[PDB]
Design a binder for this molecule. Structure first.
Ligand SMILES: [Mg+2]
Ligand SMILES: [Mg+2]
Ligand SMILES: [Mg+2]
Ligand SMILES: [Mg+2]
Ligand SMILES: [Mg+2]
Ligand SMILES: [Mg+2]
Ligand SMILES: [Mg+2]
Ligand SMILES: [Mg+2]
Ligand SMILES: [Mg+2]
Lengths: 114, 206, 96, 98, 127, 79, 150
RNA sequence: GGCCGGGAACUCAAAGGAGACUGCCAGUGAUAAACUGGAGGAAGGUGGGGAUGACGUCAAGUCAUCAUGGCCCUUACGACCAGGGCUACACACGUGCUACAAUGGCGCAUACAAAGAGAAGCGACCUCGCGAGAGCAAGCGGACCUCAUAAAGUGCGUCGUAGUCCGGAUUGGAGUCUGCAACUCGACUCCAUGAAGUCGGAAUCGCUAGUAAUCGUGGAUCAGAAUGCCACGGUGAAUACGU
């Protein structure tokens, strides 16, 4: 089921499947179950109607999918358009966590640019 | 450069420490500093005193400072004058009741530090570097001992290129822990360059 | 060693004691959860070098800021140099 | 009922101080607990030997802090002072406690 | 009557108490299996036993500490075979014949300086 | 920015910036306390932050507060 | 070199008691995890011994009988040229190599769990079916094809 | 509950001593040295490992530890202060850590160790906190107390070979603590994000046994920045014809 949108995890346990929802990890997923009244081993797919209904209803609290990936980029901009070292880093494809650039950074900049 | 320090590699056996005194981690650190301050002063104020060793014991807030000089007379002075003089300074330099006992010497020609400190002095006196070597050796080997090895560093004769001199008589097994060797050095500050000196005196095995 | 620097350390020592020793407490005091006082938190501005985390030990003998051993209070070098002449008690070539 | 923390750098020395405290204390009443050894704490010291570069050099030293327990049972009036009449050796260290 | 056997290997100190009676085995105040049960360990302990009858031979009191799994097991086996000599100084010849009386002088090597693990020499590559 | 509880700043900028609050905006503020957090009092003020070379015309802004006057003045020159 | 070691005596198989089987477990063993090894050797040694119906060490032996090389080439740098010369493999080596090949090939059988893989490869071997036997074929073909130097 | 008397046996602690010499046996070797096995024994062939590095070689390294001949700087190459830089990044090379998973991941249960550190320290107990951590405050200068409830492992269960409950980089939001001071540039916690990576060319490195491999533990430096260094123990291989 859409649950939060598109994402339709099946077979996998409710917990490990719920995580598929863009914006939740082992924590948010493991809690949403009990909080809603669902086991862990329970297969989201095999689950009965209500056993999937509450999910959506409760996951509506925390932000997910779009909104997240959406506003998440806004926060990145807020500082970029600001002009602080942080933002400045992004508009330069350089690490903000204060790492070393002279070496190791392929994840930030990318593969060699010889 | 190799060869481990003998007196150091023997600090456990056949060779006693030069500062036997207990102390905990806290003040152990500062405890050495004073040990250091007193030594240099006791060494400067006692130039031609011909002192070789200078043990240092630290009992209950007290200090020992046992000097092993070849010329005690001067170290003593007029009725213990010189000695008494030093004692006060030490106590002040260490900030505690310090003492000072004198120790004679079993022939200077057989003591490391002495033979060294001396052999070096001669150099400053513009004496044939080579002569001093053999001279000091001859005596040591004569007054006893079973082995000796003098070694003068570089810049001998004032050559543009420094070169270490050798020479040594008798057996000097530095590899034998159970050999006991009187080793000591002394730098000779020449008119144009320092000149290290190392003396190896083997008295007896066990 | 650098004489200038060698003395530089000393000053920072006295200051730290002659001041913060009996003043730095302010932190756990007006600058801690009791009544945390922006005012008192702005007062600390005056000593500076009085801070403890400003020393560098340095070799008592020489002054090597690096090679150091709290125990002997000397630099990695001097330790070995002196330890060999038996100037340091109970210290000898360790092996096992 | 009185403990004696004996600490020396070399066993040769410590043993003497111990055998001494016990020796005299044996003829002043107390039966004494006994010259117990206890584990020896040995601080090690690894340090570069060569100046500048040559990390694969280094040199190791150590300090074996020997100790004894002693502790005299059934103390005595004279016994206590009997220790003042005997307390030397700079290499050793005592710490009489309860 | 009752016998005792030290036994130790790889810094593993063990204490055995050879005592006549069926064949109980209690290590560290616990069952032989409650320590090495269903493990390739509770076999070596019986080795000296299985070699000269057990289960219906006698019961010992094991008290081992220091070391590890294989350490404990191996250690105990030593104490046992050791104490056995007390009950009968003859069976030794056989115990020894099977490499028992001996003590594994094998011990972890101290990490030498310069190396990376007592022997592991870090690659220098560039020659 | 971790400072647990208590936005820290240097006394200098404070006594100086406060004057600006009343006297109103005007010339910059030659300051080196780039490690001090920006406050809403200096909001849109004429400040100046050092960076090894010299000072830079730093002006406070709405959201530009919980930050340090320094994270707005780049130091190292890069192409 | 001058040294003259030999065959480091190995502890006999626990659940059985066969020296050969023992070393087979070591070859498969990894990270000094001897227990984990046995937990895999037997599990697979059983799932197979079952099918074959006969005792493990039999189905085990048969499997090896195939993956058993008799000769191999030995590099030789004589005369500025590395001539590949074959030679009959000693008895002890024969069993070793076989076991090594079996595991090394079984480990990369893309199955689900090591155990299952081992079991399969062990079977295929008993009838020149798996990769284990394959190796021996390529190795044996190396020889003869160099019999000239032989 | 060694908990209590009590017991000095045992483990241990730590000072002294015994023990291994090719000493003994036989064989090869000239009836030598030796070598090869065997006995006895905890250990056998300089038992294992340290420490110990000849005469000298490289005008090898270090005037930045220190010392020093000479030469230079002496309102300046000297001295002080704040901020910045030494953490720059389009690159390349060496040394490492963690991965690519099922000899594994994850959950729960749960067993065995060594060696060390500590009054400006180690810091429990209990209280609060998702957690880092905070409050209160005992004990220990230490086989008493604390750091400290080892990891692999063993049981059970789940996962199902998937770029996958693999792997964690990156980054976003919010916080703890150290120190005047965490922008530049600290460590860590929480939620979220979840890259590359599917065992790596030519070439190349270490290691012959408690070694390799693997798994944890402590310390020095130190307010606060270890995957480094030094050190400890658990588990525990393969192979050696031959030059
Ligand atoms: Mg100077
Ligand atoms: Mg510091
Ligand atoms: Mg290890
Ligand atoms: Mg030798
Ligand atoms: Mg040169
Ligand atoms: Mg100069
Ligand atoms: Mg650097
Ligand atoms: Mg610490
Ligand atoms: Mg630390």
């Amino acid at each position: 089921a859409r649950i939060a949108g598109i994402n339709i995890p099946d077979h996998k346990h409710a917990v490990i499947a719920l995580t598929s929802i863009y914006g939740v990890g082992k924590t948010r997923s493991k809690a949403i179950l009990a909080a809603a009244g669902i086991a862990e081993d329970v297969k989201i797919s095999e689950l009965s109607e209500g056993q999937i209904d509450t999910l959506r209803d409760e996951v509506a609290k925390f932000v997910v999918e779009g909104d997240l990936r959406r506003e998440i980029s806004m926060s990145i901009k807020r500082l970029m358009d600001l002009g602080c070292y942080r933002g400045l880093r992004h508009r330069r494809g350089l690490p903000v966590r204060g790492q070393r650039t002279k070496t190791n950074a392929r994840t930030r900049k990318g593969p060699r640019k010889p | 450069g190799q060869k481990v320090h003998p007196n150091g590699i023997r600090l456990g056996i056949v060779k006693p420490w030069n500062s036997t005194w207990f102390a905990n981690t806290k003040e152990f650190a500062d405890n050495l500093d004073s040990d250091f301050k007193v030594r240099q002063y006791l060494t400067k104020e006692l130039a031609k005193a011909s002192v070789s060793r200078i043990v240092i014991e630290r009992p209950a807030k007290s200090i020992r400072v046992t000097i092993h000089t070849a010329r005690p007379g001067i170290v003593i002075g007029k009725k213990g004058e010189d000695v008494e003089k030093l004692r006060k300074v030490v106590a002040d330099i260490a900030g505690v009741p310090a003492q000072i006992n004198i120790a004679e010497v079993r022939k200077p020609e057989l003591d490391a530090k002495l033979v060294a400190d001396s052999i070096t002095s001669q150099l400053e006196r513009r004496v044939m570097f080579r002569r001093a070597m053999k001279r000091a050796v001859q005596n040591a080997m004569r007054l006893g001992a079973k082995g000796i090895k003098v070694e003068v560093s570089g810049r001998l004769g004032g050559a543009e290129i420094a070169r270490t001199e050798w020479y040594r008589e008798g057996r000097v097994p530095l590899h034998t822990l159970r050999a006991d060797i009187d080793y000591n050095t002394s730098e000779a500050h020449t008119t144009y360059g320092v000149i290290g000196v190392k003396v190896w005196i083997f008295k007896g095995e066990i | 060693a650098k004489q200038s620097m060698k003395a530089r350390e000393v000053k920072r020592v006295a200051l730290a004691d002659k001041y913060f020793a009996k003043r730095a407490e302010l932190k756990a005091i007006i600058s801690d959860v009791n009544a945390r006082w922006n005012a008192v938190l702005k007062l600390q501005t005056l000593p500076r070098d009085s801070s403890p985390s400003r020393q560098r030990n340095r070799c008592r003998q020489t002054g090597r800021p690096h090679g150091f051993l709290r125990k002997f209070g000397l630099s990695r070098i001097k330790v070995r140099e002196a330890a060999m002449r038996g100037e340091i008690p109970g210290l000898k070539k360790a092996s096992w | 009922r009185i403990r004696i923390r004996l600490k020396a750098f070399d066993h040769r020395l410590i043993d003497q101080a111990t055998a001494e405290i016990v020796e005299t204390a044996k003829r002043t009443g107390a039966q004494v607990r006994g010259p117990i050894p206890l584990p020896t704490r040995k601080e090690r010291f690894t340090v570069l030997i060569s100046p500048h570069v040559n990390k694969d050099a280094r040199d190791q030293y150590e300090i074996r802090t020997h100790l004894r327990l002693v502790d005299i049972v059934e103390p005595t009036e004279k016994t206590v002072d009997a220790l003042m009449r005997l307390d030397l050796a700079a290499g050793v260290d005592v710490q009489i406690s309860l | 009557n009752q016998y005792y056997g030290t036994g130790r290997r790889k810094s593993s100190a063990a204490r055995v108490f050879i005592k006549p009676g069926n064949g109980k085995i209690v290590i560290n105040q616990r069952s032989l299996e409650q320590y090495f049960g269903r493990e390739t360990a509770r076999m070596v302990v019986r080795q000296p036993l299985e070699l000269v009858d057990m289960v219906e031979k006698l019961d010992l009191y094991i008290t081992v500490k220091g070391g590890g799994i294989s350490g404990q097991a191996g250690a105990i086996r030593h104490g046992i075979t050791r104490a056995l000599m007390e009950y009968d100084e003859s069976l030794r010849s056989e115990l020894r014949k099977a490499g028992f009386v001996t003590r594994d002088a094998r011990q972890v090597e101290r990490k030498k300086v310069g190396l990376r693990k007592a022997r592991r020499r870090p690659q220098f590559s560039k020659r | 920015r971790s400072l647990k509880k208590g936005p820290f700043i240097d006394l200098h900028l404070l006594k100086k910036v406060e004057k600006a609050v009343e006297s109103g905006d005007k010339k910059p503020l030659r300051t080196w306390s780039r490690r001090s957090t920006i406050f809403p009092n200096m909001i849109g003020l004429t400040i100046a932050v050092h960076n090894g070379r010299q000072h830079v015309p730093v002006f406070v802004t709405d959201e530009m507060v919980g930050h340090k006057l320094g994270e707005f003045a780049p130091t190292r020159t890069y192409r | 070199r001058r040294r003259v070691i030999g065959q480091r005596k190995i502890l006999p198989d626990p659940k059985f008691g066969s020296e050969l089987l023992a070393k087979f477990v070591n070859i498969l063993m990894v990270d000094g995890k001897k227990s984990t090894a046995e937990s895999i050797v037997y599990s697979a040694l059983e799932t197979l011994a079952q099918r074959s119906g006969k005792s493990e060490l039999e189905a085990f032996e048969v499997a090896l009988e195939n993956v058993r090389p008799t000769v191999e080439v030995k590099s030789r740098r004589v005369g500025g040229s590395t001539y590949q010369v074959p030679v009959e493999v000693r008895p002890v080596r024969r069993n070793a190599l076989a076991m090594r090949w079996i595991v090394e090939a079984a480990r990369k059988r893309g199955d689900k769990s090591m155990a299952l893989r081992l079991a399969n490869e062990l079977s295929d071997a008993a009838e020149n079916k798996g990769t284990a036997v394959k190796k021996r074929e390529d190795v044996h073909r190396m020889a003869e094809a160099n019999k000239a130097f032989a």
